[PDB]
Design a protein around this ligand. Structure first.
Ligand SMILES: [K+]
Ligand SMILES: [K+]
Ligand SMILES: [K+]
Ligand SMILES: [K+]
Length: 120
């Protein structure tokens, strides 16, 4: 039903910063989760961060202390601020919504590529 659209991917230096955003085309309950996942070369997709109730967050340990998730409730948009970027953060980043009526359905965006370069 609702369409999720990521923006902000690109090519960034190791140690750099990048901010992704994901806007939904319809109303998302403040009590649903909006989150980020990523899929790196040769690996399965993995959880990155999620947020609900405006400010209640959870991060994968691989990114905790480097990435920040935030959310604008009115605008149905979630954001992923990346700092201290590492080459191992290179991946396609996908935003997702998890409904909390029954925790049974997840909705996915189309993905945005983030490439962290080790070349100086
Ligand atoms: K809160
Ligand atoms: K927390
Ligand atoms: K909303
Ligand atoms: K450089």
């Amino acid at each position: 039903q609702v369409q999720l659209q990521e923006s902000g991917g690109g090519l960034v230096q190791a140690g750099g910063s990048l901010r992704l955003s994901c806007a939904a085309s319809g109303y998302i309950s403040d009590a649903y989760y909006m989150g980020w996942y990523r899929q790196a070369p040769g690996k399965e997709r993995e959880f990155v961060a999620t947020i609900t109730h405006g400010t209640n967050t959870y991060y994968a340990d691989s990114v905790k202390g480097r990435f920040t998730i935030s959310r604008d409730n009115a605008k149905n948009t979630v954001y992923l601020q990346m700092n201290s970027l590492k080459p191992e953060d290179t991946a396609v980043y996908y935003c997702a919504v998890l409904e909390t009526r029954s925790y049974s359905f997840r909705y996915w965006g189309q993905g945005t590529q983030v490439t962290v370069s080790s070349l100086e």
